[PDB]
Amino acid sequence: MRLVRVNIDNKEIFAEEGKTILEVAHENNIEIPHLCYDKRLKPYGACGLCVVEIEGSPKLARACSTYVTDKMVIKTDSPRVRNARKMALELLLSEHRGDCRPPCVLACPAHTDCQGYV
């Protein structure tokens, strides 16, 4: 078929027209964070973790809803993108209540999974 040419993280990729940046990067083993995406569902654009830097666009684009076009240059780990993802994650952690690990595991110097084996 007709193939678009993209540059994701300094790697030249020949993708197929009609895919999103998330799908193209998944195919080429490039990790882009995402929390509200699902291949069975229409895009939602809520979490804001999949933002990538596209050369020529002043605003970061959601990789889950942006489609790859011909002669595209994409950065997925630039300092702007990392800062945006860190800010989104901090906002998410602000409204979070939980124990990732129980206090018993954290009090063990060797971090033995006390809860797990109990």
Please give the annotated binding residues for [2Fe-2S] cluster, written as ranges: 35-36, 47-48, 50, 64
Please give the Cα distance from 109 to 22 (Å, whole number): 40
User: Hey, what amino acid is at 11?
Assistant: K
Query: Site for ligand FES (CB under 6 A): which residue of 8, 62, 72, 74?
Result: 62
State the binding partner of 71 from ligand FES, ligand SF4, a copy of itself, none, CB within 5 to 8 A by kind.
a copy of itself
In this structure, what DSSP letter does residue 3 have?
E
Q: Is 52 a binder of ligand FES (CB under 6 A)?
A: no
Helix (H) / strand (E) containing 81: helix 79-94
Among 4, 8, 50, 74, binds ligand FES (CB under 6 A): 50
By CB under 6 A, tell whether 49 contacts ligand FES: yes
- φ, ψ for residue 62, nearest 5 deg: -70, 120
